[PDB]
Amino acid sequence: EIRRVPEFGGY
Amino acid sequence: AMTFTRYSRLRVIAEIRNIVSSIEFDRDDELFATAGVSRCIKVFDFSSVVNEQCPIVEMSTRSKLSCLSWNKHEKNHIASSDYEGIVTVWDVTTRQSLMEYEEHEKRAWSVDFSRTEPSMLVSGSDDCKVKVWCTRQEASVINIDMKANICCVKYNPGSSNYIAVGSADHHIHYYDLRNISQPLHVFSGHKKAVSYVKFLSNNELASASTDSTLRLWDVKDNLPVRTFRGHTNEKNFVGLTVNSEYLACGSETNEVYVYHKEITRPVTSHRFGAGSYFISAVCWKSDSPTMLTANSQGTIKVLVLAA
């Protein structure tokens, strides 16, 4: 989990 | 230009038997360093590793490390980015932290020392900022406020005026640091966060994404070039390394993959060797067929492309 790539879905 | 016909496999030439988040060669490809969750930057002698397995330097850190970048002029200096957001420049001979840059407010995923202006380094963070630093100044020199988490920042190898920024917004933002009001170009094509960006040359940029692709881009004329497929990367930072001809990346199948830049499917792959492990870091030895690799168990292998 520590090397999970961030996901972004905002503005 | 086209050496791929020489190769069908990766041979293991050495193995050092947790996660290694980063593995990188020094300026002369003589030493390499590893770092990750264990809060310890370890420096190994490459020739010793191939001929023999104890590090020659171990530097304890305050936080897990995400990335290392060696200085391209000061042989003994190496930067790290950590999960507290701190960007540190270390001297591996004295073991001292020379600079501790603390402006990021969240984990910093990436740091990169410029090849051509070697006192300059750039970092990117979950705080959505890119920060450019100079080793002679305590405060950041440039700050770019972006809209999304920054996973990777890399200087162009020929000029410290250009950086590629891999963003969680799925795009690569290519900036001229002389005018940061708008990027020079934003490269769309990935369907998920862009986890790594690396240059093959002054004009050729590669990227990796959690859409299970690598992509090649032309930053002279701002064009998409090629998409590479075969590996599995839907979740994790699995590593990307490129040279003049080849791209290599990890996989969530615990396999290393190698692509020639002209061919969309792998030239070869290697299973690291029950468990769900992933390759976590890769680094070519410059333009040679030799590569460093590491995985989420902490195993390090030196691999070489071979007939």
Side-chain angles (χ1 to χ4, degrees), chain A, chain B residues 1-63 65-307:
Chain A
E1 184 72 11
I2 196 68
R3 294 296 281 167
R4 179 174 187 97
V5 179
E7 300 175 351
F8 172 88
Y11 300 80
Chain B
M2 325 305 301
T3 62
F4 62 85
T5 60
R6 298 179 193 169
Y7 305 127
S8 75
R9 66 190 180 126
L10 288 155
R11 295 187 67 189
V12 180
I13 72 171
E15 181 169 349
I16 310 175
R17 291 175 300 96
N18 47 357
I19 302 162
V20 176
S21 300
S22 184
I23 192 162
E24 295 289 335
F25 278 108
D26 78 358
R27 176 197 73 188
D28 301 318
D29 292 344
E30 290 172 347
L31 306 182
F32 66 92
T34 61
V37 183
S38 72
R39 303 195 196 176
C40 187
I41 301 168
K42 295 186 179 181
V43 182
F44 296 89
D45 184 298
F46 178 79
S47 57
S48 300
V49 168
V50 170
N51 300 341
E52 72 204 351
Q53 292 171 330
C54 191
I56 61 162
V57 183
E58 296 173 89
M59 301 180 303
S60 284
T61 66
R62 302 177 173 176
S63 183
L65 295 318
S66 54
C67 193
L68 299 172
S69 183
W70 290 91
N71 194 280
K72 279 74 184 176
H73 183 71
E74 292 283 0
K75 158 83 157 165
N76 302 323
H77 295 181
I78 189 175
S80 61
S81 52
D82 73 29
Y83 278 60
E84 190 182 337
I86 294 174
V87 177
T88 306
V89 179
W90 305 85
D91 186 320
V92 306
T93 69
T94 63
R95 283 77 152 175
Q96 301 311 296
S97 64
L98 295 176
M99 300 293 280
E100 296 182 3
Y101 297 116
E102 301 188 7
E103 300 179 7
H104 283 299
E105 294 179 279
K106 296 191 171 171
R107 67 185 59 185
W109 286 117
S110 189
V111 60
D112 191 44
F113 258 126
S114 167
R115 178 165 302 279
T116 60
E117 199 54 271
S119 72
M120 304 302 295
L121 60 158
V122 62
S123 57
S125 167
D126 271 345
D127 70 3
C128 306
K129 311 300 184 53
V130 173
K131 293 176 177 283
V132 177
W133 314 93
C134 175
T135 58
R136 296 186 292 279
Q137 294 193 64
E138 283 171 321
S140 60
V141 180
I142 303 172
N143 180 87
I144 309 175
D145 294 329
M146 302 181 72
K147 298 186 76 62
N149 308 50
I150 299 311
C151 298
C152 194
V153 192
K154 200 75 175 70
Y155 273 109
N156 186 284
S159 175
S160 68
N161 291 319
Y162 319 111
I163 56 169
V165 180
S167 176
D169 72 7
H170 310 176
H171 314 308
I172 298 141
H173 303 241
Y174 191 59
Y175 277 93
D176 186 334
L177 292 176
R178 296 167 297 183
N179 183 357
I180 59 154
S181 70
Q182 279 282 328
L184 286 172
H185 194 79
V186 177
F187 294 94
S188 296
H190 282 300
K191 313 311 175 196
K192 297 260 292 276
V194 181
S195 50
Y196 296 85
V197 286
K198 295 295 184 73
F199 294 84
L200 290 76
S201 70
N202 289 344
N203 298 335
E204 297 167 289
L205 176 65
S207 54
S209 169
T210 47
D211 67 5
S212 293
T213 74
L214 314 182
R215 288 174 191 250
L216 182 61
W217 315 87
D218 168 355
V219 299
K220 179 179 181 176
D221 288 317
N222 296 327
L223 301 176
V225 182
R226 189 156 303 108
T227 302
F228 305 85
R229 286 188 175 84
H231 64 287
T232 301
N233 181 201
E234 293 292 300
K235 305 185 183 221
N236 299 128
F237 285 100
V238 299
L240 175 66
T241 182
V242 309
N243 64 18
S244 63
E245 274 193 280
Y246 294 92
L247 303 83
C249 66
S251 186
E252 289 148 12
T253 56
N254 205 32
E255 298 164 319
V256 178
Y257 284 74
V258 173
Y259 299 92
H260 187 275
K261 73 181 185 190
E262 296 297 327
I263 301 171
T264 58
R265 299 198 182 282
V267 164
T268 191
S269 58
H270 168 74
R271 299 193 63 188
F272 238 54
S276 308
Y277 303 116
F278 59 99
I279 304 307
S280 52
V282 290
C283 187
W284 288 113
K285 188 165 174 298
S286 297
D287 287 332
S288 78
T290 300
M291 188 199 311
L292 302 177
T293 64
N295 83 341
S296 58
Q297 324 170 261
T299 304
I300 300 161
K301 300 188 191 189
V302 183
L303 305 183
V304 188
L305 287 168

